[PDB]
Amino acid sequence: DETYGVNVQFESDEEEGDEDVYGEVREECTLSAN
Amino acid sequence: SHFDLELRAAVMHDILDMMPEGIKQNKARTILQHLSEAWRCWKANIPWKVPGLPTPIENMILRYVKAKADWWTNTAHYNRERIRRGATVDKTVCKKNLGRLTRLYLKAEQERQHNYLKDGPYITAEEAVAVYTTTVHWLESRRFSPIPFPPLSYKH
Amino acid sequence: VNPKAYPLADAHLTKKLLDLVQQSCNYKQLRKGANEATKTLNRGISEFIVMAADAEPLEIILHLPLLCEDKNVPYVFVRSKQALGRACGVSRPVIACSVTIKEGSQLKQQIQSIQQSIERLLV
Amino acid sequence: GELDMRKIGQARNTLMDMRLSQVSDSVSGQTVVDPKGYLTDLNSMIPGGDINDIKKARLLLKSVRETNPHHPPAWIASARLEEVTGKLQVARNLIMKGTEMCPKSEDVWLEAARLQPGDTAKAVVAQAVRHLPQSVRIYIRAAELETDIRAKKRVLRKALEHVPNSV
Amino acid sequence: DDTNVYRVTIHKTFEGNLTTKPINGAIFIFNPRTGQLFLKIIHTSVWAGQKRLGQ
Amino acid sequence: MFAEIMMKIEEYISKQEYRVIVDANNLTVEIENELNIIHKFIRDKYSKRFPELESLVPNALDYIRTVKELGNSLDKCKNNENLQQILTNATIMVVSVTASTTQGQQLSEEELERLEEACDMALELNASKHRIYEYVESRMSFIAPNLSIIIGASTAAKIMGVAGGLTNLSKMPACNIMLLGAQSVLPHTGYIYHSDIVQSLPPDLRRKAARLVAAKCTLAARVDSFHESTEGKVGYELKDEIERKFDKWQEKPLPAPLDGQRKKRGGRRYRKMKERLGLTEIRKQANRMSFGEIEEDAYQE
Amino acid sequence: DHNIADYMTAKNNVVINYKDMNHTNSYGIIRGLQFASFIVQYYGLVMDLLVLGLHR
């Protein structure tokens, strides 16, 4: 489909406590002398 | 306590006594500005040499600055001892002391740097090469690969 | 004035030269400064070159008529450098200006008249 | 007369430096790069455009993806904005999110095949054929990402068995 | 209703690029009692070159 | 080439056009590189007899004089009156400390003779370069005193050789005198950029000092095109102005408090004013305390 | 790298400036440098090899 015309929604979303959404814990020559 | 103020007043009285009557209208203010400038210059380790200042007045200013500097250093040390011991002091005293000590410590640091420049390196050449041989033997024993310059395509 | 400054324009001639210099600098056809005038005379795009007799020293402008003998351009000396600087649209006095030709400008007839009137003063 | 105090200190310092350099010459493992050479490479490495305009375009693409998750033109624009600047892993993740949020889209499947490597592009073409079969573009992308004669022949045989009316 | 105030159209080209042109939007203030709908038109130049976020 | 240039310099100095000074300057510029190559060859040849003489003597002429005075014999560093006139006392003490523990074998007779011949050739080349520089300075003082006093005699001789004399340099603008002598090297740098008057400046203010010295050099060349300014007072005034500009380039009572009307009108620009400082923030839940409950940890602060 | 080492050493030999006072710090390290934390942990290690000996 062409779908000419799409509105945008710019807001201050994605607010969290610096954690990961997943229930699971957030995944993290040499010298030689002559 | 207030030795500096009395010293300044006495030197001003002595200078203005030996002063022509018809000229002392503004020369008193000029020489006071000169005294303040000399004190500031000593506090900053910068040369102070007024070209047009006659040498007797200049020598009196030098003596006054020497006396005030001795009193300044002594009272700064005494106040630091009082504060470190635990005596009751207000903010102004501590602030002033810190300023004085800062000036004194930078004076001492400049003297130390100049002493290093004059007396050369304090570590002897053979002492330095012994330290270097120790370090190279350690790093060779550790098979330590030296850290390269941050690569342009550094992954991290 | 300076005897080495030749030719010297009259009062109405200097007034017409200042009006032409103001009309050229307003229409972006004039270059102020001795280095810009030398660059315009070296490129061969300068229609006229004006100098100032009140320059200390005037010898730094002495190559400006001689380059006018190397590119066949009319040369003239103003009475004062401050008047030439005020006619060039600047607060600083200008000692040498170059009125350059443009691609079909409206001031081409006035520039031709100034070149015809400045070629008869040097005799 | 007068003796300059700095000269003896400098002489002794230079002597110590010379001794240390003489000792250090026995060390073989030391590394050093050419400053000028490295710089030139940096020069050549200098490329994007405006950072604020690219950030505004990325914010607009994120807002269009949040306002329309089932818009494969929005997913293709977000993948193009993430692949034209930054890293390709975020562009591959955005293409995978657009393929998972907007199924039966040939343009989003082609963008996910072009943004991912060939080992992932084969699985992306298989998922696109499982989600939207009888696609000539997905079959051509699967045959082009085979890098073999027999694999492309088998992909062409599977495309002829799926859609025999494709010239 | 101001959801259609900021709208853009994604024109995808076949070879080389794909542009996203913001179009003009309209904030609709509708009165149900009188049937009057004020369509405040916001031009495309108000959001193209502002260098600001949604706040 | 050097013998004919030396004979021309001797014929010019015995009688006391403009191409002879440029030829002597080019011969001196070639002899400087020849003496540097001879000093490098002498340092590579005498490295077996004294490996620490190069680090102790960074100058080429000082190392050449130290190799000619001491040579293979390392006993010429104790109370040597000839070495005290070349180097300083601390340099002589460092040379004696390096010769006390040298760990190097002595050279042969032919190698020492070749090193002495190279040192004598380098000394003769340095003397010929000094004589050519003195002759070029005399020719610059006789030709153009203002350009020789402002930017230097050798710089004015090089500018007259590159432009084609004082008559050709006077018809050149400041933009041509600034790039006079150009060719990774630094771009837009000519003979006036690496001069002695441009070397007494920081590198951040070196291009501006060169651009300010180029216009003064062009004005001095235009003043020396005729027979005027034979003293050099205009060049001295330009040098004093350049020194004042280089010194300038290098290194209130509290108003009476009052309370007028804070604002008489609003709207219009007033709004942009607050927008700059005092714009519409969240203005909620930021200066609020939530009397009842606790956000985040109790005493996180 | 030698370039890094030269940069680190040169960063220490700078001018330390108070309000009206300044001097060239040529002997000691600054400790205000972000990488000074590294230097102290390295130079000290050297003294460790002096205290402990390369064997122990």
From Swiss-Prot, chain A:
Expressing tissues: Widely expressed.
Compartments, as annotated in UniProt: Nucleus
Quaternary structure note: Component of a core complex containing at least PRPF8, SNRNP200, EFTUD2 and SNRNP40. Component of the U5 snRNP and U4/U6-U5 tri-snRNP complexes, building blocks of the spliceosome. Component of the U4/U6-U5 tri-snRNP complex composed of the U4, U6 and U5 snRNAs and at least PRPF3, PRPF4, PRPF6, PRPF8, PRPF31, SNRNP200, TXNL4A, SNRNP40, DDX23, CD2BP2, PPIH, SNU13, EFTUD2, SART1 and USP39. Component of precatalytic, catalytic and postcatalytic spliceosomal complexes. Component of the minor spliceosome, which splices U12-type introns.
Function noted in UniProt: Catalyzes the ATP-dependent unwinding of U4/U6 RNA duplices, an essential step in the assembly of a catalytically active spliceosome. Plays a role in pre-mRNA splicing as a core component of precatalytic, catalytic and postcatalytic spliceosomal complexes. As a component of the minor spliceosome, involved in the splicing of U12-type introns in pre-mRNAs. Involved in spliceosome assembly, activation and disassembly. Mediates changes in the dynamic network of RNA-RNA interactions in the spliceosome.
Family indicated by similarity: Belongs to the helicase family. SKI2 subfamily.
Protein name as annotated: U5 small nuclear ribonucleoprotein 200 kDa helicase
Annotated source species: Homo sapiens (Human)
Segment of the intact protein contained: 196 to 243 of 2136
Curated annotation (Swiss-Prot), chain C:
Modified residues (Phosphoserine): 117
Modified-residue entries (N6-acetyllysine), positions: 16
Gene Ontology BP annotations: box C/D snoRNP assembly; maturation of SSU-rRNA; mRNA splicing, via spliceosome; ribosomal small subunit biogenesis; single fertilization
Record's keyword terms, sorted: Acetylation, mRNA processing, mRNA splicing, Nucleus, Phosphoprotein, Ribonucleoprotein, RNA-binding, Spliceosome
One protein family per Pfam: Ribosomal_L7Ae
Keyword S-adenosyl-L-methionine annotated: no
Site, Interaction with U4 snRNA and U4atac snRNA: residue positions: 56, 81
Spans annotated as Important for U4 snRNA-binding: 91-123
GO cellular component: box C/D methylation guide snoRNP complex; dense fibrillar component; nucleolus; nucleoplasm; nucleus; precatalytic spliceosome; protein-containing complex; small-subunit processome
Result when mutating residue 33 to K: Abolishes U4 snRNA-binding
Region (Interaction with U4 snRNA and U4atac snRNA): 31-43
Subcellular location: Nucleus; Nucleus, Nucleolus
GO molecular function: ATPase binding; box C/D sno(s)RNA binding; RNA binding; U3 snoRNA binding; U4 snRNA binding; U4atac snRNA binding
Entry-linked Gene3D superfamilies: 3.30.1330.30
Record InterPro entries: eL8/uL1-like, H/ACA_rnp_Nhp2-like, Ribosomal_eL30-like_sf, Ribosomal_eL8-like_CS, Ribosomal_eL8/eL30/eS12/Gad45, Ribosomal_eL8/Nhp2
Keyword Acetylation: yes
Primary site of residence: nucleus
Tissue specificity note: Ubiquitous.
The family this protein is said to belong to: Belongs to the eukaryotic ribosomal protein eL8 family.
Name assigned to this protein: NHP2-like protein 1
Species this chain originates from: Homo sapiens (Human)
Lineage: Eukaryota, Metazoa, Chordata, Craniata, Vertebrata
From Swiss-Prot, chain D:
Phosphothreonine PTM positions: 31, 40
Location in or out of the cell: Nucleus, Nucleoplasm; Nucleus speckle
UniProt HAT repeat ranges: 147-167
PTM annotation: Phosphorylated by PRP4K during spliceosome assembly.
Chain positions found as Phosphoserine: 44
Tissue: Widely expressed.
Assembly: Identified in the spliceosome B complex. Identified in the spliceosome C complex. Associates with the U5 snRNP particle. Component of the U4/U6-U5 tri-snRNP complex composed of the U4, U6 and U5 snRNAs and at least PRPF3, PRPF4, PRPF6, PRPF8, PRPF31, SNRNP200, TXNL4A, SNRNP40, DDX23, CD2BP2, PPIH, SNU13, EFTUD2, SART1 and USP39, LSm proteins LSm2-8 and Sm proteins. Interacts with ARAF. Interacts with AR and NR3C1, but not ESR1, independently of the presence of hormones. Interacts with USH1G.
Pathology noted in the entry: Retinitis pigmentosa 60: A retinal dystrophy belonging to the group of pigmentary retinopathies. Retinitis pigmentosa is characterized by retinal pigment deposits visible on fundus examination and primary loss of rod photoreceptor cells followed by secondary loss of cone photoreceptors. Patients typically have night vision blindness and loss of midperipheral visual field. As their condition progresses, they lose their far peripheral visual field and eventually central vision as well.
Name of protein: Pre-mRNA-processing factor 6
Native organism: Homo sapiens
UniProtKB/Swiss-Prot annotation, chain G:
Free-text tissue specificity from the UniProt record: Widely expressed.
Subcellular location: Nucleus; Nucleus speckle
Annotated signal sequence range: none
Disease: Retinitis pigmentosa 13: A retinal dystrophy belonging to the group of pigmentary retinopathies. Retinitis pigmentosa is characterized by retinal pigment deposits visible on fundus examination and primary loss of rod photoreceptor cells followed by secondary loss of cone photoreceptors. Patients typically have night vision blindness and loss of midperipheral visual field. As their condition progresses, they lose their far peripheral visual field and eventually central vision as well.
Oligomer and partners: Part of the U5 snRNP complex. Component of the U4/U6-U5 tri-snRNP complex composed of the U4, U6 and U5 snRNAs and at least PRPF3, PRPF4, PRPF6, PRPF8, PRPF31, SNRNP200, TXNL4A, SNRNP40, DDX23, CD2BP2, PPIH, SNU13, EFTUD2, SART1 and USP39. Component of the U5.U4atac/U6atac snRNP complexes in U12-dependent spliceosomes. Within the minor spliceosome, which acts on U12-type introns, interacts with PPIL2 and RBM48. Core component of U2-type precatalytic, catalytic and postcatalytic spliceosomal complexes. Found in a mRNA splicing-dependent exon junction complex (EJC) with SRRM1.
Name this protein carries in UniProt: Pre-mRNA-processing-splicing factor 8
Organism: Homo sapiens
Residues of the full protein shown: 1002 to 1057 of 2335
